[PDB]
Structures are given as C-alpha cells and as structure tokens.
Amino acid sequence: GELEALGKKFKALAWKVKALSKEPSAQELEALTQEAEALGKKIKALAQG
Amino acid sequence: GELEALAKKTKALTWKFKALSKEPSAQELEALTQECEALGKKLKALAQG
C-alpha cells in the first residue's frame, strides 16, 4: 500500500543524495528538498493520530 | 507507536534538507543519505507488518 510506496520513494531519494558530489547546485538541493517536503506531507497525512 | 516515530523522523529529515548550507559538507550529505534510506527501510518493514 501507501507505506510500501512511500518507502520506495524514500529509497529513491536516498540514491539522489548519494549521487551528489562536491558543491551541488542550488537548483539540485532545492529539488531534493522539495521532494522530501512532498513525501513529508504524505507521511504527515498517513500518520495523523 | 511506529507511525508517530516515523512522522517525527520525517520531520527531522525535511528540516535537515531545509537547513542545508549553500555548500553542504560531504558528511552532512552522507547523513541525509542514511536518514532517507533508514526511513525507506522502516516504511517497507511496517508495510510487511
């Protein structure tokens, strides 16, 4: 379900951070920050209560 | 329980992204990588609960 899918998406994001090398662009850090925040919104909704 | 624990971890993760410097350290990015992977693994485990 959503737990599994959200899990896969965090693993995908882990790879993206893993690939970063010295002085990542601001555009890339912002892109990855926004993906984290989007996943964060999902988790918040799923964990209510 | 596990929901709230994963919601707090997710908030911590999003804020670490948001709090990154313009030129983040290698170590900071390793930490982010690991925290993404951990959360993804924990979500998948709970999915198989």
Residue numbers in the entry:
A (entry chain D), B (entry chain C): 1 to 49
Reproduce the article's own wording on this structure:
Here, we describe the design, characterization, and application of de novo helical hairpins that heterodimerize to form 4-helix bundles in cells. Starting from a rationally designed homodimer, we construct a library of helical hairpins and identify complementary pairs using bimolecular fluorescence complementation in E. coli. We characterize some of the pairs using biophysics and X-ray crystallography to confirm heterodimeric 4-helix bundles. Finally, we demonstrate the function of an exemplar pair in regulating transcription in both E. coli and mammalian cells.
We attempted to crystallize all four selected pairs and were successful with 26α/26β. The 26α/26β complex formed the targeted heterodimer of hairpins, which was confirmed as a 4-helix CC with knobs-into-holes packing using the program Socket2.51 The heterodimer has a syn topology. This is different to the parent CC-HP1.0 structure, which crystallized in an anti conformation. However, the syn conformation is consistent with the designed charge patterning of CC-HP1.0 as depicted in the helical wheels for the design, and with AlphaFold2 predictions. Moreover, although the anti and syn forms are likely close in energy, and the linkers in the split-YFP assay should be flexible enough to allow both topologies, we suggest that the syn arrangement is favored. In contrast, near-complete quenching occurred when 26β-c4CF and 26α-nMSE were mixed, demonstrating the proximity of the 4CF and MSE residues. These data are consistent with 26α/26β forming a heterodimer with a syn topology in solution as observed in the experimental X-ray crystal structure. In summary to this section, the in vitro solution-phase biophysical data confirm that the cognate pairs selected from the in vivo BiFC assay, i.e., 9α/9β, 14α/14β, 21α/21β, and 26α/26β,all form stable, helical heterodimers consistent with the targeted 4HB structures. At the lowest concentration of peptides that gave measurable CD spectra (i.e., 1 μM total peptide), second derivatives of melting curves returned melting temperatures of 43 °C for 26α, 30 °C for 26β, and 48 °C for the mixture 26α/26β. This suggests that the 26α/26β heterodimer should be well formed and stable, whereas the individual peptides should be unfolded or partially folded at concentrations close to those anticipated in cells and at the required temperature for cell experiments (37 °C).
